[PDB]
Design a protein around this ligand. Structure first.
Ligand code: HEM
Ligand code: HEM
Ligand SMILES: O=C1N[C@@H](Cc2ccc(O)cc2)C(=O)N[C@H]1Cc1ccccc1
Ligand SMILES: O=C1N[C@@H](Cc2ccc(O)cc2)C(=O)N[C@H]1Cc1ccccc1
Lengths: 394, 394
């Protein structure tokens, strides 16, 4: 006698478990047990993943309902699960989106100078260097401080919330509330700070005093600050870190991109496709009875959309484990999701990785792991897969 | 068909696997496979563990022989496996031992003041706090700087080697050689530095110029510095960290020790007994054919002495999972080993933990985990079991 198949399979972000392909071939939608003890439908083929993400009756918002089967415990207030919905309803979608495009004057140059400075310091200190704690994560943090319009010096303290904020836990986390309330207070103070006139918080601060936004709550304005910092920094920091592992392990690709840096955008799109940064399927709660492949999903049930299921599906991406810069469908991956909840920071995430990789290859063309790859320590029970340290030499 | 049982069982240091007791009862010496692919004899009862540790024909030195079955790859030069042997042969055993006793004038007071300062800063910053990175590890580091007689400011950089130096790896680690050579250079410089006149390095520095030690190599003198810093800091830092977890999870004991701090030494001895800080059995290579229980161990074979096997053996420590302050045999545990290779820093390790715990309970009587205990991230493929962060509130 065995127990129901449990998720997640492995916290390692350097290889995809064989079970994924076995599941996709034989049972692309199937029952599993989450860390909370709830049952869920795990969906692992490109066709069925897209079907779920494109049908709003599979609701993100409703995952926060009391009594629902849960993937993990909330680390934010239940209303914050509908964060983008709330922003849209407040008439703030356009303003937020304009504030987070990588095409802001001087922003890409700021990224370049920042990446270059970080790398110069590592070279000066000498090998080994930690490319997560001393490159990818400070770069992500520096970027989001600039995008938000908040002091660079405040970045490290806001960052220190994230190892807890993005936990994937069976039970509520007392520290998450403490940090959340503190960070919300920080952002409420930013909105009242006359020095803060640029970036996303500068724009929110002015819209807050505009009579057309008079009935938008101060709670929402502070929430947008905390949530976009946290989601942007964890996503870009983790993606860049795991992408660098994928590159370091592919010297031929590394040499090609070094030689022809104009191929970097196509390289990053493939790195996105094969990336295992997301530790759990994307959760949705059925709000009707809906047929998904061989299964009738019932109202109230939890569905988990497995991004690497879709992104490694050989029916959509032939030879899926190989980085190939000349695919006919290169942006059709699900790394940024699909449908109603498509990542609003996708352009910014792309540019973050492109510039980070550009600068690394320029400065450290001899980059290699300083420890055997099995020695990386993979963070557990977290919403992302990431090594605690990424030791490299050059 | 199944493969040979693999070690280690789990990197979690907050619970002992059920398999340990099952092994001890049914097969207290049995064949296993290590991470290198080698076979070894795993020994898990108190009686057989003591037998192996007390018989020098089970050699520590010989584990470093070329072609031997290995638990893991060397992170030090092969001659350094015989470090204490080398010290003894150089006539330096007494001098080293005298230098590392916790009874040095002002040393315990330095520990108290240091622990108190660290805790005050955490209280000032506010919850949550990380008791590994911001308490146990700086306290261990501060202590060993003082014991060695080296600047407190040099501690953090020497510490940064340890996440690699004490890896338990299948293959050699390039970063370990880089850090090793650099740290050896640092210590060679300390021996020539006229400012360094106290502690272990001050004493080695004077013995180096004494004609009775004229033919002791400079290599050995620098090696003693690097090895005692590294082993002392990793062992005390890791033990204190995991001991604090054991305490936090036992509020009744925590209250008793708070109320009657004179019981702390007896508390620490039990915390040592139940501690799971050591990630692997202690390795020994047979140099003869020797009967151990039902098995004839052959010359050249690897034997792994499982400390928690012995320390949780109900035949020697009845109700072994319970901390009981009134045992008749309280120091007969194997936390510091046994025989030829008994830990030379045992008194210092005891005092480090006693003072750290004393100060914590005084300052933070309300200490508790700030995250569910399953959320701790346990370091993998390492010679110690430790959480990457220990978030607490008070
Ligand atoms: C390469 C980096 C990034 C990756 C891989 C990524 C991935 C994703 C994915 C897969 C989703 C969809 C989740 C779902 O449908 O359940 C999402 C949504 C979201 N992301 Fe990103 N993201 C990245 C960067 C960013 C950045 C830079 C920001 C903001 C600065 C951001 C903020 C958000 C927000 C607020 C949502 C929720 C959207 C909604 O609910 O409609 N992300 N992200
Ligand atoms: C509570 C903290 C400590 C624990 C739990 C601990 C544990 C141990 C154990 C179990 C051994 C025996 C290994 C074997 O036989 O294979 C050992 C040996 C050793 N320890 Fe400790 N130790 C601690 C503190 C220290 C300190 C503070 C120092 C130095 C400052 C130190 C330096 C050494 C050295 C050099 C050896 C090798 C002894 C030999 O080969 O004869 N340890 N330790
Ligand atoms: O639940 C949500 N919360 C935030 C993201 C977020 C989560 C935790 C945190 O501490 C800060 C920010 C959101 O905007 N949208 C949704 C979905 C989401 C979760 C995680 C990352 C991105 C989106
Ligand atoms: O192999 C040894 N090396 C050192 C300990 C040591 C290991 C690694 C390092 O980077 C620094 C110090 C020793 O003294 N004795 C032996 C056994 C030992 C290993 C680990 C801890 C304690 C003792």
């Amino acid at each position: 006698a065995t127990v129901l198949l449990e998720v997640p399979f492995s916290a390692r972000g350097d290889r995809i478990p064989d079970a994924v392909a076995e599941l996709r071939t034989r049972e692309p939608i199937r029952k599993v047990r989450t860390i909370t003890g709830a049952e869920a439908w795990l969906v692992s083929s490109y066709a069925l993943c897209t079907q779920v993400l494109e049908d709003r009756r599979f609701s993100m918002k409703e995952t926060a309902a009391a009594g629902a089967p849960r993937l993990n415990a909330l680390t934010v207030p239940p209303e914050v699960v509908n964060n983008m919905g709330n922003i849209a309803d407040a008439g703030l979608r356009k303003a937020v989106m304009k504030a987070i495009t990588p095409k802001a004057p001087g922003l890409e140059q700021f990224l370049r100078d920042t990446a270059n400075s970080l790398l110069d310091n590592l070279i000066t200190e000498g090998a080994p260097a930690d490319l997560r704690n001393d490159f990818a994560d400070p770069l992500a943090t520096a970027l989001h401080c600039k995008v938000l319009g908040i002091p660079q010096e405040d970045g490290p303290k806001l960052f220190r919330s994230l190892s807890i904020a993005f936990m994937s836990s069976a039970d509520p986390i007392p520290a998450a509330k403490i940090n959340w309330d503190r960070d919300i207070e920080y952002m409420a103070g930013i909105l009242e700070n006359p020095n803060i006139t640029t970036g996303l918080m500068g724009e929110l601060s002015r819209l807050r005093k505009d009579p057309a936004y008079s009935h938008v709550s101060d709670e929402l304005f502070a929430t947008i600050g905390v949530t976009f910092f946290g989601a942007g920094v964890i996503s870009t920091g983790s993606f860049l870190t795991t992408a660098l592992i994928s590159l370091i392990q592919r010297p031929q690709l590394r040499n090609l991109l070094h030689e022809k840096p104009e191929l970097i955008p196509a390289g990053v799109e493939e790195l996105l496709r094969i990336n295992l940064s997301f530790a759990d399927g994307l959760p949705r709660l059925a709000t009707a009875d809906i047929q998904v492949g061989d299964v009738l999903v019932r109202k109230g049930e939890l569905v988990l959309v497995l991004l690497e299921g879709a992104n490694f599906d050989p029916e959509h991406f032939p030879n899926p484990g190989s980085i190939e810069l000349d695919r006919p469908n290169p942006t059709s991956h699900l790394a940024f999701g699909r449908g109603q909840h498509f990542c609003p920071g996708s352009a910014l995430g792309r540019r973050h990785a492109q510039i980070g990789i550009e600068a690394l290859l320029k400065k450290m063309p001899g980059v290699d792991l300083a420890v055997p790859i099995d020695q990386l320590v993979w963070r557990t029970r977290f919403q992302r897969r990431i090594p605690e340290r990424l030791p490299v030499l050059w």
